Design an enzyme around this catalytic site. Structure first.
Site, PDB file in Angstrom:
ATOM      1  N   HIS A  51       2.332 -11.187  -5.116  1.00  0.00           N
ATOM      2  CA  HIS A  51       1.804 -10.786  -3.812  1.00  0.00           C
ATOM      3  C   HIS A  51       0.474 -10.027  -4.131  1.00  0.00           C
ATOM      4  CE1 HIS A  51       2.660  -8.801   0.398  1.00  0.00           C
ATOM      5  NE2 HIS A  51       1.465  -9.375   0.340  1.00  0.00           N
ATOM      6  N   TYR A  62      -0.856   5.021   2.339  1.00  0.00           N
ATOM      7  CA  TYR A  62      -1.842   4.285   1.494  1.00  0.00           C
ATOM      8  C   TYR A  62      -3.095   4.173   2.233  1.00  0.00           C
ATOM      9  CZ  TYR A  62      -0.101   0.465   4.521  1.00  0.00           C
ATOM     10  OH  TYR A  62       0.212  -0.397   5.563  1.00  0.00           O
ATOM     11  N   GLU A 111      -6.148  -9.622  -0.467  1.00  0.00           N
ATOM     12  CA  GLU A 111      -5.706  -8.688  -1.470  1.00  0.00           C
ATOM     13  C   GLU A 111      -6.821  -7.824  -2.098  1.00  0.00           C
ATOM     14  OE1 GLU A 111      -2.504  -7.666  -1.966  1.00  0.00           O
ATOM     15  OE2 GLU A 111      -2.029  -8.948  -0.155  1.00  0.00           O
ATOM     16  N   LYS A 114      -8.500  -5.596   0.917  1.00  0.00           N
ATOM     17  CA  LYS A 114      -7.626  -4.576   1.428  1.00  0.00           C
ATOM     18  C   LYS A 114      -7.266  -3.554   0.395  1.00  0.00           C
ATOM     19  CE  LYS A 114      -3.343  -3.699   4.020  1.00  0.00           C
ATOM     20  NZ  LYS A 114      -2.247  -4.329   4.800  1.00  0.00           N
ATOM     21  N   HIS A 115      -6.876  -4.019  -0.779  1.00  0.00           N
ATOM     22  CA  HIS A 115      -6.282  -3.131  -1.723  1.00  0.00           C
ATOM     23  C   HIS A 115      -7.122  -2.852  -3.002  1.00  0.00           C
ATOM     24  CE1 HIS A 115      -2.394  -2.750   0.248  1.00  0.00           C
ATOM     25  NE2 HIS A 115      -2.291  -4.070   0.351  1.00  0.00           N
TER      26      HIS A 115
END
Ligand SMILES: *[C@@H]1O[C@H](CO)[C@@H](O[C@@H]2O[C@H](CO)[C@@H](O)[C@H](O)[C@H]2NC(C)=O)[C@H](O)[C@H]1NC(C)=O
Ligand code: NAG
Length: 237
Positions: A51, A62, A111, A114-115
């Site tokens: 993921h 977060y 991914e 966002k992160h």
């Protein structure tokens, strides 16, 4: 390439230190997350898939979307320009979007955007001889490297837990089986429709998120599964 930090750098979350290229903060809890995609199925019949890699705050909250100036719509092109052709092939197989390969690009953008942009120790200023988007490629390689160490399907199998049309499973058995590959700390175990579906393995980090030492840590969220009756649906059934 990325700066290096001492292997006795202080552990994120577990110590009180100042955010820098060698200290992940406030995103000190790093979650290597996985999926078991059965309907539709993707990846090998006997492997979970990636993921992502998420920086959480030490309290389990977060940040997201931390740097619009380093958000991209061309991850596949960035990886090719960096000659990371085996990484890209591996991504297609082990970091699929369930909907199909044509959706892989948007998933990987999501991914990173966002992160990845929220991992403080990955910023360009943490590089020697930085070249444009080097950290993007480095981030995808690091996810893969960590994922490779967290073979959920084998850990489960070794504990007698294998996908089945009829067998059902106990949470605590699933948790113990996976804890065995994570220093005795179970991942977050996520179910969907009573089926085993998602895993988050939590870590704290000595040094940089790229190349530092990832230390298995306690989950900040437990599970949304029932205690028993859990299905592990076979892929491609
Ligand atoms: C992926 O997209 C980014 C974002 O547009 C590209 O980086 C930009 O490249 C333009 C056009 O060459 C430069 O003038 C900008 O300065 C770049 N932006 C940043 C933030 O670096 C990047 O080149 C693309 N990569 C590939 C391989 O296509
Ligand atoms: C990829 O290879 C090309 C052509 O050989 C080269 O110009 C480029 O610098 C390489 N990039 C990296 C990151 O290896």
């Amino acid at each position: 390439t990325i700066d290096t930090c001492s292997s006795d750098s202080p552990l994120s979350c577990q110590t009180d230190n100042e955010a820098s290229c060698c200290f992940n903060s406030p995103g000190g809890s790093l979650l290597q997350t996985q999926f078991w995609d059965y309907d539709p199925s993707d990846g090998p019949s006997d492997s979970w898939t990636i993921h992502g890699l998420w920086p959480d705050n030490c309290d389990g909250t977060y940040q997201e979307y931390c740097d619009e100036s380093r958000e991209y719509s061309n991850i596949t092109s960035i990886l090719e320009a960096q000659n990371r052709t085996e990484l890209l092939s591996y991504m297609k197989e082990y970091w699929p979007d369930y909907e199909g390969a044509d959706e892989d690009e948007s998933f990987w953008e999501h991914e990173w955007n966002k992160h990845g942009t929220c991992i403080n120790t990955i910023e360009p200023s943490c590089y020697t001889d930085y070249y444009a988007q080097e950290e993007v490629g480095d981030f995808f390689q690091q996810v893969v490297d960590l994922f490779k160490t967290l073979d959920s399907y084998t850990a489960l199998s070794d504990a007698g837990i294998t996908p089945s049309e009829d067998a059902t499973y106990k949470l605590s058995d699933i948790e113990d089986a996976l804890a065995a590959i994570h220093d005795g700390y179970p991942p977050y175990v996520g179910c969907e429709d009573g089926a085993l579906s998602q895993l988050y393995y939590y870590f704290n980090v000595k040094g940089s998120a790229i190349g530092g030492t990832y230390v298995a840590s306690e989950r900040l969220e437990d599970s949304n599964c029932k205690d028993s009756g859990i299905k592990y649906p076979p892929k491609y059934s």
